[PDB]
Scaffold this active site. Structure first.
Site, PDB file in Angstrom:
ATOM      1  N   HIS A  32      60.330  18.799 120.386  1.00  0.00           N
ATOM      2  CA  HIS A  32      59.094  18.699 119.568  1.00  0.00           C
ATOM      3  C   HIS A  32      59.221  19.564 118.309  1.00  0.00           C
ATOM      4  CE1 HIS A  32      56.904  17.524 123.556  1.00  0.00           C
ATOM      5  NE2 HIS A  32      57.730  16.569 123.109  1.00  0.00           N
ATOM      6  N   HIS A  91      66.137  11.162 126.488  1.00  0.00           N
ATOM      7  CA  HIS A  91      66.957  12.325 126.083  1.00  0.00           C
ATOM      8  C   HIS A  91      68.425  12.071 126.415  1.00  0.00           C
ATOM      9  CE1 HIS A  91      63.213  13.993 125.018  1.00  0.00           C
ATOM     10  NE2 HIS A  91      62.788  14.164 126.272  1.00  0.00           N
ATOM     11  N   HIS A 102      55.007   9.001 120.784  1.00  0.00           N
ATOM     12  CA  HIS A 102      55.618  10.252 121.301  1.00  0.00           C
ATOM     13  C   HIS A 102      57.092   9.972 121.599  1.00  0.00           C
ATOM     14  CE1 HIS A 102      55.733  14.346 123.036  1.00  0.00           C
ATOM     15  NE2 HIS A 102      56.685  13.807 123.801  1.00  0.00           N
ATOM     16  N   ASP A 134      60.010  12.171 120.048  1.00  0.00           N
ATOM     17  CA  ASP A 134      61.124  12.786 120.820  1.00  0.00           C
ATOM     18  C   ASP A 134      62.442  12.351 120.189  1.00  0.00           C
ATOM     19  OD1 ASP A 134      59.495  14.028 122.737  1.00  0.00           O
ATOM     20  OD2 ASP A 134      59.529  12.216 124.002  1.00  0.00           O
TER      21      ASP A 134
HETATM   22  N1  LIG Z   1      59.446  15.109 125.564  1.00  0.00           N
HETATM   23  C1  LIG Z   1      58.841  14.809 126.891  1.00  0.00           C
HETATM   24  C2  LIG Z   1      58.554  13.313 127.088  1.00  0.00           C
HETATM   25  C3  LIG Z   1      59.612  12.442 127.765  1.00  0.00           C
HETATM   26  O1  LIG Z   1      60.734  12.889 128.134  1.00  0.00           O
HETATM   27  O2  LIG Z   1      59.271  11.236 127.912  1.00  0.00           O
HETATM   28  C4  LIG Z   1      57.533  15.566 126.981  1.00  0.00           C
HETATM   29  O3  LIG Z   1      56.949  15.804 125.940  1.00  0.00           O
HETATM   30  N2  LIG Z   1      57.085  15.917 128.201  1.00  0.00           N
HETATM   31  C5  LIG Z   1      55.935  16.605 128.483  1.00  0.00           C
HETATM   32  C6  LIG Z   1      55.061  17.098 127.518  1.00  0.00           C
HETATM   33  C7  LIG Z   1      53.902  17.772 127.883  1.00  0.00           C
HETATM   34  C8  LIG Z   1      53.590  17.981 129.210  1.00  0.00           C
HETATM   35  C9  LIG Z   1      54.416  17.467 130.175  1.00  0.00           C
HETATM   36  O4  LIG Z   1      54.092  17.706 131.479  1.00  0.00           O
HETATM   37  C10 LIG Z   1      53.149  16.984 132.237  1.00  0.00           C
HETATM   38  F1  LIG Z   1      53.856  16.335 133.137  1.00  0.00           F
HETATM   39  F2  LIG Z   1      52.341  17.801 132.880  1.00  0.00           F
HETATM   40  F3  LIG Z   1      52.422  16.216 131.447  1.00  0.00           F
HETATM   41  C11 LIG Z   1      55.591  16.801 129.822  1.00  0.00           C
HETATM   42 ZN   LIG Z   2      58.103  14.900 124.137  1.00  0.00          ZN
END
Ligand SMILES: N[C@H](CC(=O)O)C(=O)Nc1cccc(OC(F)(F)F)c1
Ligand SMILES: [Zn+2]
EC number: 3.5.1.108
Length: 288
Positions: free
Chosen positions: A78, A264, A237, A241
């Site tokens: 991010h 990723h 999003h 990423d």
């Molecule tokens: N870059 C990844 C997204 C991805 O790999 O698709 C990402 O932002 N993950 C992300 C962001 C905020 C909270 C989170 O935890 C949750 F699980 F509590 F929400 C996971």
């Molecule tokens: Zn993300």
């Protein structure tokens, strides 16, 4: 000449770790020409430095993690995306813990920090990586492609089998000649699911996730839609990423990115694949 940029000033921010769930201390600093973005762990003796390069990418299960021996930094995508979006070539990023603060779960807090600290032009040409010909990687039904394109365009598509998407493939495409990264991509949050979160918390993970950093979804619906900031926010999003992953090249990109249910692992696989392909790309500077 179009010149390299760094920060005018030091700037300090505080937030919580996405897994630890506790306060982490972040400092952005100006850096010399041709440094790139360099992460350093100031909670260790001696201080350990991890350049944000394709080669230094580790596990990639849920976030993009950089690694150096036993030293790592989780969740770099991010902040790198904010760096990439505001054309920051050179900066030092100091961390008091193993991860970047999650903040609101988007690039917006980082964009804001970089802007407040000021953009400082440096007396060296900005180096761009132009895609000369097509490069693609595939893992089962997942695909990521680079295409020659005169500008910077990013596209993403994903058939996510959850009712909140109404059986429809999710697609978004952003040409950055005619659309703003800050206004229309930087504030995007991902979809959290109560089943995924519910498990992860109960398996001592993602102790930082909440309604503050994600759009919580309950395997049927978004739980309070007050959280949304964008139409087609979830693919956006994915685009956010993708820009953070792509910047581990250490340079801005002239060309086109296409993501088909990628993330990723495949983004970094596409990057290493391009670097290996010497006839696929070239480096170029411009007049203004
Ligand atoms: N870059 C990844 C997204 C991805 O790999 O698709 C990402 O932002 N993950 C992300 C962001 C905020 C909270 C989170 O935890 C949750 F699980 F509590 F929400 C996971
Ligand atoms: Zn993300």
């Amino acid at each position: 000449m179009i010149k390299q940029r760094t920060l005018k000033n030091i700037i300090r921010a505080t937030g919580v770790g996405l897994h630890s769930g506790e306060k982490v201390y972040l400092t952005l600093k100006p850096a010399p020409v041709d440094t790139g973005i360099v992460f350093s762990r100031t909670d260790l003796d001696p201080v350990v430095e991890i350049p944000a390069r394709a080669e230094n990418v580790g596990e990639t299960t849920m976030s993009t993690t950089l690694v150096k021996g036993d030293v790592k930094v989780d969740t770099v995508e991010h902040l790198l995306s904010a760096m990439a979006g505001l054309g920051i070539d050179n900066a030092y990023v100091e961390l008091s813990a193993s991860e970047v603060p999650i903040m609101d779960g988007s690039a917006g807090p980082f964009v804001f920090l970089i802007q407040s600290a000021g953009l400082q032009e440096q007396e060296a040409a900005k180096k761009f990586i132009r895609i000369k010909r097509e490069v693609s990687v595939e893992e089962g039904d997942k695909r990521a492609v680079f295409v020659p394109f005169d500008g910077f365009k990013v596209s993403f598509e994903i058939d996510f089998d959850h009712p909140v998407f109404r059986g429809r493939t999710q697609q978004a495409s952003v040409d950055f000649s005619s659309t703003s990264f800050v206004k229309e991509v930087s504030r995007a949050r991902t979809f959290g699911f109560m089943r995924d979160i519910e498990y992860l918390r109960s398996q001592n993970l993602a102790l930082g996730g909440s309604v503050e950093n994600a759009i919580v979804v309950d395997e049927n619906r978004v739980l309070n839609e007050d959280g949304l900031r964008y139409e087609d926010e979830f693919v956006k999003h994915k685009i956010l990423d993708a820009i953070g992953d792509l910047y581990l090249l250490g340079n801005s990109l002239i060309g086109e990115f296409r993501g088909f249910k990628s993330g990723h692992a495949l983004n970094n696989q596409l990057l290493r694949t391009l670097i290996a392909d010497k006839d696929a790309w070239e480096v170029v500077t411009f007049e203004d």
